[model samples]
Target chain A: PIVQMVHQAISPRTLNAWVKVVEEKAFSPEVIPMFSALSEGATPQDLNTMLNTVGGHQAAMQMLKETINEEAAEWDRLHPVHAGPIAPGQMREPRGSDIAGTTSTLQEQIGWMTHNPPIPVGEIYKRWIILGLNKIVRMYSPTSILDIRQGPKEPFRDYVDRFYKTLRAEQASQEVKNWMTETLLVQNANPDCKTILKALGPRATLEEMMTACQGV
Target chain B: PIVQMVHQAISPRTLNAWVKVVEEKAFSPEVIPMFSALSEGATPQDLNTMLNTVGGHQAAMQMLKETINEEAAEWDRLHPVHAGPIAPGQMREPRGSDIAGTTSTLQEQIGWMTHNPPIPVGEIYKRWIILGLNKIVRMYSPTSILDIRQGPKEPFRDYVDRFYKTLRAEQASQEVKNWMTETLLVQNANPDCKTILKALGPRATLEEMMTACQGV
Candidate 1:
């Protein structure tokens, strides 16, 4: 009903484009409303609630993921030799900063576009549904999110250290650890595992954590 | 051997990136200097001569194109959804001017980086070889070429008109026309053709042109 109401308000072409982006990114169509809510000063709790309700479309999520992975794979295939090494280099690196700046500008443009969506919300919803489904079926996987800390930002190195620590504390699942180790080895064979271990604190490894769990 | 020189000058990562771009876009890496030269005020004749001589490494060109296409295809597969008919009433459109501004910023930063490239030129060269190749390849595809044309300064429309006229005047083989009408239709379908035709003359379908050619 909401979708139909929204659809009645916009051009077909505009609706189609919005849907395409959602399908490609594997993000929930509900994200559009969430973004709208945010732009209108909704709280994080409000966002969470919306996501929980409308964004709980498992099929849509899966489709979005597939679509993203497909694009990632396509990028990899296009440049098989360079795919592995050409990461967004160290933030402190001048070249890295340049790329970050470009990315940031692009993101700003995208944000503006999202806020002033050209199509009606209903058509946008339909577009998302189609894109979300296609993406789910495709099994697309995107690389790690590129975090460009702007707007009264801390020093790059400090920000990165804080980020890594937070990430290790919060999302250090076995899969994540394995991925981190793989990425580290590929990028820097001589990486200090102790740095990661330090970040893990008491729950350094599975064996260590198991003993601690048993003691508790 | 600019290719060999470039390969030797940058890092393996950079080289691979460049190669991926060039190959994917179907550009001759050896012709890069031609672009640079043209940018720096080289005449078309000069570019043609340079390209005809030092830039004609069939094997290198093929290798580069194949590599880039593979990466492009992979990327495309992953990011299957087209970028826009961005939703109306949802967000703002990223203006060509915005991208141009970002590119200008990027160029300035790169200029600064060039003064003291973080890695040695040789190491950087490798990374660039990869990145540059990829960039070149991607550039080949037609997209919005942003213009600064305001008022009587070679109105953007007029430039487009002249470009099409020049292209049409060129003695393109029948094969080329067929290819343009087929493979290049999507790009040509953009408002550029319509604007160009409106500015220059009447519009004629490819089929009409083909029929006329057949009679001739």
Candidate 2:
């Protein structure tokens, strides 16, 4: 539903504006041309995997913030203190600070973009998804998560955090994911964590297995 | 030779200064601790593979640039220019501009790090090699380059460029690299490029084969 919300928020007109802002702001100059070229004809469905993957949404949100606040300092300079009480019944224009304060959610961020004259939130999401795909194709593989293991001397809690992070980054159906994670949890857990997990029984649910490993 | 040059350029004293700057400036906050922790015990020989790999050197060089220029503006503030006049045999203190301008090579960049109190060049190189290794282990397999194929509608020149770029990123020995590149060139070339390459004969050198495909 949140993703569908993203789908509807970006119009062609707003998407172009938003992507340009990210091209100029979020990416380094070396990658600007590559991203600009890739994003030219991309569709929301084409980018669906990135949003669904773990860390993808966070990457998008960071880029969205960068684009949204690209001109925040300049906006501040132009609207120097209109100090003192406003005339009765007259609302003061929102300064850049006010606009930048609420970015906790993409849906909320898009609402702010409706009149801000910069890239909209949906396009930010879209651009980052494209970047994620490029990184996957050129530098990394999404399926590489299967190789993760608990590092020597890494705390059990930290290893679980990393395992879940890797698990979520992979794009798989829930059933397949359940099978894979269950196998990996048993195989890669530290020895002490392994013993605790084994005691939960082979049929124990992922949540239960994970919960049992807590504080170890 | 450049790598050996790099190995010698960084002193234990200077390496730490350079790495701290990159940790603070080049990387995002989330990765800072990972890098700082990694760099604490790294050595040049440990980082040799990254510097020797194709894009690894560039990645290190870029991080070096970020660390070097991190305080360029602040440095300018500390030593503002006095309007035109010169005392006999008196050299002006180097502004950040002078130090920042010559980053064409790693050797030159490390030379500039001797006096500046940030992480040294060796440590910067050491840090990035560790980062690259981490990325390779967690997200990608370096051997995956063997799977690269010429894309549909891709230009021959472009495909060859990408092929070599991928080739360099891999950490194969010289003989192994020659064999792999030769095999890949024949197998993955587009139809038009393949015909041109095949005529060069099986015994033709990699350079000769690549040269034959140059225009097509």
Candidate 3:
């Protein structure tokens, strides 16, 4: 049932990719959620073997679905309901942190499309992505997020680091990134470019930096 | 003459290592310098057959022993200068098929490691054998002997010769050889290849050897 819930939530592509990763035994425990039912200490090979034993990737996906279901089930058991027959005057359940239905989940998205058609490609993909960010944002308390802004904020290094932590549908150019890295660093009142950059301005080659610095 | 020079200059342990090298026939014309002679020309089959001749492998013990006799008696009429001099801008050395050239590589290694002298003989021998075997192993496919290398010049050669000796780190036979070919080629591309690979950590597109090797 939880698997059905999960199956309902994710896109065909994510599901396909996950299935492939699991089938090849390339899935590390950290790459996917581990089962509370499985051993605490398991090697990657051990995880792989168990998935194979349980009928491979599909079964593994089912197990993950069950896991999420189980966790949710435990929460529902608390019996903190909004309006039971005994309390018809209706004290409502406390609202979860965010707008209750403000976000559309992967499950809801999938449900809307392909209500059995070819499943209209891009709609499902957008939903898949939207749901992913939605999950990440949910973990914060009242302050960690204030309604998901498509995004902003920061100092140089801190800002650059923080900036990248969000979703950017349109990627910024290298110079924009560098200039911001410079801008944020200055704004935050810090300067040295100490963060080990995956790229250095053109290195001994100045032209390499020129491109990255262009927009800025 | 250089082999003779190196042979005479080497330590007895290095000399003994060289004997092991000969005993392994790792120095056969088919193996090391392989068919520079044959390419002028000879088949790998030709190289393989001759190695089995003149008393085969160990008879190569005294290296030049039977070969000189075998050549004089068999091809004495040809009077081949297996050892010829350089022609102007070109440099030429006698076929590495002989004992002189066979042990030269090991002899040079001993010289390089002279100060380091590789702590233990077994360890030193372990290192020696790999370098020696790479010479022989890389023979069959001359193209395989290509410019592929991983890590750096010294580290790359050292890795090409060493690393795989550890653990069951080796997979199937063909896989083992090809992996070595792939690893060496990839590693040799840029000394900083590890960073490149780590970034690739786990993905498809196995052999970066050729592309990374491009522009080199």
Candidate 4:
């Protein structure tokens, strides 16, 4: 039921991106049935049937789980407020400067109001939608490829370990765990080890065990 | 005048983030005076005097430019629209969910009407506000961080280099350069690096370069 619920929520385009990544890793083609079945709101029994047809892979299952979790985290954080289905040819080019100006003014007002007293109802709503759209635009922007290409300069494992350490030290909230889970899933799915090692100044491949997951 | 403009443009908290980084590089404390002098809208002659006092570090200047450019990009991105300003004595939280829903509904209505023709001004404004607010919320959301941070998974040079590549690619459009400039500044600023790198992987350390700059 949970898998079916997830399948129903995702779009074909999104499913494709996920499938592409998985395929790149040479995951068994049989896993495709599991996804297809899941998309149709198939039962766990159906999923089992699909898995059996192709032979189950523990590593593949782990990989798939990690990918789903990353996507789930992104969706959870976005919490899209459906503005209703956008009809074909209904979308317009953004108004550019006007939109930028409106967003900046709205943010300033919010910041100012936070310091002063008495908030207006109209103002409150205005703030929420403006911020929300900004987030959507950022999410949809074509720069994902660019961002992913830039590898970090320091030791990668130390960075993750430190984050975990900080999460433990801060006695962080559930949100932190959610963030970490999401992070772990995404990084694992898109290891890009070659790119990362090349970018890190001197400490490129300090940990051998860490690199094996690259194939996963 | 320059100092005042800089102060007004950025909060002390934001400026402190830059200052903390600069102080860490072992440059003399006199640099602050030079900065202050520059901020005071000092003349070129006065600027030269101040510059001389610090025994100029080109690297420091580059770092400062990178830092300010980053801040300016964020500021430019945020400077529009008035989201509701929450005050100290106001209600717990101003209306948010309802307003977003209303705005979203109105926008859909407007789009539908436009396709059918005969759109009304009242409805247009309503839709405009909704669209505008949505953008604002998005820009300010944590997801914006996600967009900005996602780049490093690919490569650091790619992250920085893409701006120029894009600028060159879209050289015919002044508008494109302006937009790229905004994003480039923000990229150089390296805001929320830790959060973003953590998302890339549990072991990602690409954030260290920014950390090093923070000390500059």
Indicate the residue-level lDDT of B177 in model 3. 67
> For residue A153, what is the lDDT in candidate 1?
33
Q: Mind sharing the TM-score for model 1?
A: 0.17
In candidate 2, list every pair of residues with a backbone clash. A18-A119, B14-B120, B17-B118, B17-B119, B17-B120, B18-B118, B18-B119, B18-B120, B19-B119
Quality class of the docking in candidate 2, CAPRI style: incorrect
lDDT of 2 by residue, B11-113 (tens): 2222333334443544322343544453343333223311221121232333333444445556668878676766764434445544433322322443434
Best by lDDT: 2
- B1-216: candidate 1 lDDT, tens digit per residue: 123112111122222233344335345334354345322322122222222222122323333334433444454465454576757534322222211122122223223223332212222222223553434333332332222122333333444454443334333477875555344432333353334434433356644533332321
lDDT of 4 by residue, B65-158 (tens): 3443444344336543356765764322112222222223433333333333433322222332323323332322332221333243434333
Rank by TM-score (best first): 2, 4, 3, 1
Sort every candidate by lDDT, greatest first. Answer: 2, 4, 1, 3
The model with the greatest TM-score is: 2
Off by over 4 Å in 3: A1-132, A138-163, A166-182, A194-216, B1-216
Question: What would the per-residue lDDT of candidate 3 be over residues B108-175, giving only the tens digit for each residue?
Answer: 43333332422122122222223433433332122333343444544433544444332122223776
Model 4, B120: alpha-carbon shift in Å?
A: 44
lDDT of 1: 0.32
The per-prediction CA RMSD against the true structure, in angstroms, equals 26.8, 20.0, 30.7, 24.5
For model 1, give the RMSD to the true fold: 26.8
